[PDB]
């Protein structure tokens, strides 16, 4: 839940405004003075890609995912750039491929014979950990990811010969890929293609002729192996050599797109009719991810300069970039209507038709699986440890979380916001301010849970535009990437729902030469402007991508948004080096149920192992964190509390009779559905066991006091509906899905309505 | 009895992560958290 | 190069501090590592925002507003200046053995706080029990008259 | 079993003499691709001895000694009052230790091999550092 | 009641402390809540190990071995006896404000530790870098002879 | 005369990380031992 | 918390060393970091076994039995206590050059050792060749008479 | 390191021996080879159990129980202390060479005989090592001229 004023959008939400995107700290940005229309029809979006685990210790070389591990080691490791990383890798590969001594020494080691041939029967086995440990000494570097890529190259070319043990395995995690390409991401997608051309020549080395002469003769000298490896190393090194700067390719192909996008380019510096008729410029011209990447380029750099020969060189640098993009990459070209279909929109309407509140939300799918593992060391002062999954606990919690996913839809939250805003509406037009916008993105709070980050700093980043410098790099570098993604996704939604876009050029203060921005030409049939513009002429021209959402109709999401759980079950024998401790949580819990029976209070404690079917308190086990479930439940809670606070604010100043009865009936209907929801949770696996244990702890405490059994018609029903509400809160307390402060405030809201009394009043008969 | 003291003093081939963190967190256990009060 | 938006308020405050005293000019010249002359250190301030921030750390009486303005404009000068500006504070010899005497007692505070709820719930419960009896009697009499 | 004891004694003596000649020939090479050839050959023999002893230790009587020695430590440790056992005893060092112990103890419970011979043959793997550069185990259960 | 292994060391200890000085008898009678006669307090000690531990806490010189032996033989008395025998230490006025100056610096130590490894690995690395250079030469010389 | 010095500085930075990481590590290894004892004692009482 | 089995051997030894000399009290207060009073450092000893081992290492005459019994009963404190307890064994200026001259001798010793067997076999063979010739004549006389 | 169970009985015994007499300095300098200060030899005993067994075997006044305790605790030092604990018993003038004293020496001679081969082979090798250096040069010059 992020609340913004659509009128004071500068001081309200600067982190998503286009003035901030092209360098306006002030509010000064023009209406469409000088204009040039454009029609976007494609975009480079990433796929539906989430993070996963991949293992490197085997004899395979997968070039796309070694490229991906370079991405994560360069960016998410705090290193310089994947451009510099691929440059040092080319230097390393040149030094080991143009050196004949190395490919003799580490074949002498892994064959055992320096000068004399080996027979076909006296063939032993050396594990790849040993050849890695001596490759570290022979060919030194400072990056382990080069020694891995050399190790499994030589294990790939020796594995049919039978000189290596297939035993060991070893696994890293790969990270989260952004959807919308930055300038730097375009540079990196050009370098990653050249690295993939490097590695796919190493991946094709067969040693079929070496195996054939081994079988035919019975023996082979180590010099044939040392030649057959050092030939293939140089065949990849020959692919490595003779490349373009990715920076100077992308900066030159984005600058000429700027100069033929803008309406006010000088006649001097202006692309001629040859390069303008380059095969492919007509497709890169109507592309939107390139527009926002151009804005980010001229934002960061400030200006742009050409280096290449602008007549014949640049008319054959462009299809190299087209091939780098059109290759299998993270970023694929798609139509503009495809990439942003999980967004939905609704609004609260006046009698004239004007919006008062507008809600924009992401449509999610509740993930309902969960895993419990235990970490097992290998040796002391060595973080090589690996970790064992435990069925019979993860199965219990999965079977408990699977009914809770069938009651927490995301459409049924905005559908309750709208009923609130239609039930508390007066009869009077809205003129004093624009229609305030709430945007419900569970992904913000989900990354706040996933990185252990305060939500105040993300809300502050979206509000005042800037990020904080106090927090560390592994959270700031994800905050800035997330913030760029939200700006880009807003503009894809706005352009895909208002395809009438017209490019201007900002030159008011003009701290740059030319920095472009769209405007929209949405037709409205309204009279009073939301935001601040002029509504003249049957249509409005607005520069900002959020007001163009504030004039739409209700839109329905066609696709859910999906996050998948990480994979500990399949590879359970490998050792784990990725940080398992940030993505797992400690699981221990204590709760207690109290009830007064004729002026005497009875308390029943309960622990988590008694609920989980365990007898012994185990203390090593850790749950992999349910961030999607927790984020959906947090958005639901914050919306429930906000709706109740607005109805309590409007019931006091209603000053009417029928509208006052409507507000009161709305509150009662609201609280009884909340109570039935929690009580339906408290009949699941953990909840029913908590009931059957807390009842036993109560009953064996009434043992000394002889008391007469009660009516057993209503009294059983009342005590049943109270114990189930307690169990339903306790299970969401014990899984991380609810804090104790918010469970306590939710209990206060349910208690001050006499909601259990109004529910039991419909289990009587008069 | 068959002694294993010579076999005991070995070493495992150490190999670095891509991302640091989570180092000294091997043996720690905080107290269990409580539930909210019910009424 | 320092941006003019910062420089407009940053330069005359440093110039007025130099006109107040020249004894800090030798201090900032030995601190940054430039020439002792005011024109040389002012050119270093104009050409490097890190040198400007180190001068606005050496003087902070009048240069606090200019320091905040350079802070709000450039973040990277702050990210480097927190590392370049670090004074290890003096520690007492009795500090850790003094802190060992409170282990028995912070545990008792937390074992109360887990039961009561929050820290604020503990403080408000402490105040409510330490409160006077006549407030309880006033509460009972307002409930007797029919108010809640 | 005098014939089988003779075969395994001849095997043990020739196996120790091979390591003696390799460790003696490495010190007099003064050549890098020969020092690496001998250092590769020694590792390549040590891992095969480890595989043979563990293939013995996961047969009938070896598997029985493995299950018995694990179960008595589990019962002793649960009586002690701490149950980190099924985690910490199925792991890359403390499973190779128990398999190699069982594969030697079956040969000592027969007549086929002496205890000092088993202890020296243990010290070979303890010095070659081939116990911590393998980790995986192919069991017969 | 009380274990005889505890009683054989506790009863002559308390009786010898009373024979050494009688002013502790009224003190333990007020602290425990028994009659001021030595027969009454000694029968209370022989009857109750909680009372026995309270007396062996009130006398401290000649009763420490008997107190620790009671703590060995009676594990169930430990938490209740520690809860009954509790005195809150006094806090310095400047302690929390003196502690607030160190937040900038324990974070520096932890950021060093996350790089080095363990806290023990940091201590050993700092010792190795503080170490003399002749030990580096001795390491290189033993490796030069062929000893590892 | 300073090619001998800057090369060693940049080689140390290649191992550590950034120059900011080198400055912070030099400050930590210049730091007094009492702070290490203080962090050990807060970890001993159960505070991360 | 320290075990009672360790505490029975640790606390009266520290109290006896303090009663023997108070000059060690300021020494251990500066080494551990507590207040200079014996009550405060005794509270530190009873609270933390690392501090107990540091005190029993600082007092060296009477605390060896208590130190080794602490090392028996708390096995997990040994690595951290060894990390905290480190003093530079001072190296001699001629030691590395005096050591480098013995490569001529140790190689011959190890080669004769490999020819004989173990170092124990070499020492026993050297003793057999050092032993008198009368023993060879006596054992020949016993072998002639029949004694093997 | 040294075992604490045997260290608690081994360190005060040799400490009382050094406090009783200072005449053991030449013994611990000649038998061990350590530095002459009494702290260095005590650190050598605490570091090396073979040196500890030598210091328990060099005296027989009070350290016999500690030597037998170390023998029962660490069986791997038994043969090495048996080898270094060898004094050549000079002569008994009679004919009966009883095995109360000579059994170790005749067993050592027969162990060397089991190594070498014949008893006459051991006597021959004893004599060949007893011979002058010049006979090696004579055999080498005859084998150089072309005779064998």
UniProtKB/Swiss-Prot annotation, chain A:
Pfam families: P1
GO MF terms, alphabetically ordered: identical protein binding; RNA binding
InterPro entries: P1
Subcellular localization(s) per the UniProt record: Virion
Record keyword Transport present: no
Intrachain S-S bonds: none
Function: P1 is the major inner capsid (core) protein of the polyhedral procapsid, which is responsible for genomic replication and transcription. Forms a dodecahedral shell from 60 asymmetric dimers. Binds to RNA and may be involved in genomic packaging.
Name of this protein: Major inner protein P1
Origin species: Pseudomonas phage phi6 (Bacteriophage phi-6)
């Amino acid at each position: 839940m992020f609340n913004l004023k659509v009128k004071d959008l500068n001081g309200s939400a600067r982190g998503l405004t286009q003035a901030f995107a092209i360098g306006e700290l002030k509010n000064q940005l023009s209406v469409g003075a000088l204009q040039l229309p454009l029609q976007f029809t494609r975009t480079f979006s990433a796929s539906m890609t989430s993070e996963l685990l991949w293992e490197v210790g085997k004899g395979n070389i997968d070039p796309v995912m070694y490229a991906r591990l370079f991405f994560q080691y360069a960016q998410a490791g705090g290193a310089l750039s994947v451009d510099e990383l691929v440059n040092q890798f080319t230097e390393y590969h040149q030094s080991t491929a143009c050196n004949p001594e190395i490919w003799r020494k580490l074949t002498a080691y892994i064959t055992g014979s320096s000068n004399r041939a080996i027979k076909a029967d006296a063939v032993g086995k050396v594990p790849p950990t040993a050849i890695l440990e001596q490759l570290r000494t022979l060919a030194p570097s400072e990056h382990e990811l080069f020694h891995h890529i050399t190790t499994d190259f030589v294990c790939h070319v020796l594995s049919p010969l039978g000189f290596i043990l297939p035993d060991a395995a070893y696994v890293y995690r790969v990270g989260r890929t952004a959807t919308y390409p930055n300038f730097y991401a375009l540079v990196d997608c050009v370098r990653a293609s050249d690295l993939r051309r490097m590695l796919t020549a190493l991946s094709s080395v067969d040693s079929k002729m070496l195996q054939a002469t081994f079988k035919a003769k019975g023996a082979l000298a180590p010099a044939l192996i040392s030649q057959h490896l050092a030939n293939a190393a140089t065949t990849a090194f020959e692919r490595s050599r003779g490349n373009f700067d990715a920076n100077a390719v992308v900066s030159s192909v984005l600058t000429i797109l700027g100069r033929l996008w803008s309406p006010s380019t000088p006649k001097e510096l202006d692309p001629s009719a040859r390069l303008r008729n380059t095969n492919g410029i007509d497709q890169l011209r109507s592309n939107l991810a390139l527009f926002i990447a151009y804005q980010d380029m001229v934002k960061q750099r400030g200006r742009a300069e050409v280096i290449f020969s602008d007549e014949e060189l640049s008319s054959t640098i462009i299809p190299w970039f087209i091939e780098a993009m059109s290759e299998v990459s993270p970023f694929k070209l798609r139509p503009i209507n495809e990439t942003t279909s999980y967004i939905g929109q609704t609004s609260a309407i006046d009698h004239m038709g004007q919006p008062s509140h507008v809600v924009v939300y992401e449509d999610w799918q509740f993930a309902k699986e969960i895993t419990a593992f235990t970490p097992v060391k290998l040796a002391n002062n060595s973080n090589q440890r690996f970790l064992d999954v435990e069925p019979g606990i993860s199965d219990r919690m999965s079977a408990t979380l699977a009914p809770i996913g069938n009651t927490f839809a995301v459409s049924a939250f905005v559908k309750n916001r709208t009923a609130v805003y239609e039930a508390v509406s007066q009869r009077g037009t809205v003129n004093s301010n624009g229609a305030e916008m709430t945007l419900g993105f569970p992904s913000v709070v989900e990354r706040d849970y996933a990185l252990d980050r305060d939500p105040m700093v993300a809300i502050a980043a979206l509000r005042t535009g800037i990020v904080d410098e106090s927090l560390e790099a592994r959270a700031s570098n994800d905050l800035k990437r997330s913030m760029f993604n939200y700006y880009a996704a807003v503009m894809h939604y706005a352009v895909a729902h208002n395809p009438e876009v017209v490019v201007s050029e900002h030159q008011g203060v003009a701290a740059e030469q030319g920095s472009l921005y769209l405007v929209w030409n949405v037709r409205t049939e309204l009279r009073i402007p939301v935001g601040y513009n002029a509504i003249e002429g049957g249509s409005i021209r607005t520069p900002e991508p959020l007001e163009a959402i504030a004039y739409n109709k209700p839109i329905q999401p066609s696709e859910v948004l999906q996050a998948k759980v990480l994979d500990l079950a399949n590879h359970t024998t490998s050792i784990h080096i990725w940080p398992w401790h940030e993505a797992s949580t400690e699981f221990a819990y204590e709760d207690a149920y109290s009830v007064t029976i004729r002026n005497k209070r009875y308390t029943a404690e309960v622990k988590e192992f008694e609920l989980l079917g365990l007898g012994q308190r185990r203390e090593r086990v850790r749950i992999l964190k349910p961030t999607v479930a927790h984020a959906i439940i947090q958005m639901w809670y914050s919306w429930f509390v906000e709706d109740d606070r607005t109805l309590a604010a409007a019931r006091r100043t209603s000053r009417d009779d029928a509208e006052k009865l409507a507000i009161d009936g709305r509150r009662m209907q609201n609280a009884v559905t909340l109570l039935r929801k929690i009580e339906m949770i408290g009949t699941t696996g953990i909840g029913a066991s908590a009931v059957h244990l807390a009842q036993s702890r109560i009953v064996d405490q009434m043992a000394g006091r002889g008391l007469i059994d009660d009516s057993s018609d209503l009294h059983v029903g009342i005590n049943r509906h109270r114990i189930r509400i307690w169990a339903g809160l306790a299970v969401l307390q014990m899984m991380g899905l609810l804090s104790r402060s918010e469970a306590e405030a939710l209990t206060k809201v349910l208690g001050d309505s006499n909601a259990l009394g109004m529910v039991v009043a419909t289990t009587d008969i008069d | 009895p068959t002694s294993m003291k010579a076999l005991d003093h070995t070493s495992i081939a150490s190999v670095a992560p891509l991302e640091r963190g989570s180092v000294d967190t091997d043996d720690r256990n905080s107290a269990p958290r409580r539930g909210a009060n019910f009424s | 190069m320092l941006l003019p938006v910062v420089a407009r308020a940053a330069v005359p405050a440093i110039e007025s501090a130099i006109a107040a005293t020249p004894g800090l000019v030798s201090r900032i010249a030995a601190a940054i590592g430039s020439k002792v002359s005011p024109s040389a250190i002012l050119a270093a301030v104009k050409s490097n925002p890190v040198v400007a921030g180190l001068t606005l750390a050496q003087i902070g009486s009048t240069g606090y507003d200019a320091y905040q303005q350079l802070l709000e404009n450039h973040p990277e000068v702050a990210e480097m200046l927190k590392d370049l500006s670090f004074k290890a504070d003096e520690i007492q010899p009795d500090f850790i053995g003094n802190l060992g005497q409170y282990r028995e007692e912070l545990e008792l505070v937390e074992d109360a706080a887990r039961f009561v709820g929050g820290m604020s719930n503990l403080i408000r419960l402490r105040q409510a029990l330490e409160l006077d009896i006549k407030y309880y009697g006033l509460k009972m009499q307002l409930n007797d008259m029919g108010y809640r």
